[PDB]
Amino acid sequence: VAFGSEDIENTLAKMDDGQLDGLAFGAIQLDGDGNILQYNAAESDITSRDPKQVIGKNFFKDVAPCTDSPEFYGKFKEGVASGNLNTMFEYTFDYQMTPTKVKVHMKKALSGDSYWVFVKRV
Numbered sequence: 001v002a003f004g005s006e007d008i009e010n011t012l013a014k015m016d017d018g019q020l021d022g023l024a025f026g027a028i029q030l031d032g033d034g035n036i037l038q039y040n041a042a043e044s045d046i047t048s049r050d051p052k053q054v055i056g057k058n059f060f061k062d063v064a065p066c067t068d069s070p071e072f073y074g075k076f077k078e079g080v081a082s083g084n085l086n087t088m089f090e091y092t093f094d095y096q097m098t099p100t101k102v103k104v105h106m107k108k109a110l111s112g113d114s115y116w117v118f119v120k121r122v
C-alpha cells in the first residue's frame with residue numbers, strides 16, 4: 001500500500017479505478033506505447049489533469065512532454081523492451097502546472113502488457 005513497495009504491482013494488479021483513487025501516491029497505468037489506461041485521483045491532485053480527460057491520450061507525446069527525455073521516457077522504453085521495468089528517480093513536472101519536484105517509480109505490471117508510473121511529491 002506504500003510508495004516504493006517491493007511487491008506494489010501485485011497489490012495493485014486487482015484494483016479498479018475506484019480502489020486506485022484510494023492510493024496515497026499518484027498512479028498511472030500505461031500500455032507499451034505510453035497511452036494512458038488508468039490515472040488516479042492522487043496524480044490528478046499533483047498535476048491538475050482531469051482523469052477522464054487524459055485516459056486514452058499519449059503520456060509522453062501530449063500529456064507530459066517534460067517527461068519526453070532519456071531520463072524518463074528513455075527508461076520506460078528500455079523497460080518495455082527488456083520486460084523488466086523497475087526504476088526510481090527524481091524528476092520535475094512543470095508543463096501547465098507549477099514546477100513540482102517528485103520521485104518517480106516505474107514498474108511493469110503483472111499482466112505483462114501494461115506498465116505503472118508511480119509518483120509522489122518530495
Ligand SMILES: *C(=O)/C=C/c1ccc(O)cc1
Nearest residue numbers: 047064065066093094095
Ligand atoms: C512535464 O511536463 C510533466 C507533466 C505531467 C506529468 C505527470 C502527469 O500525470 C501529468 C503531466
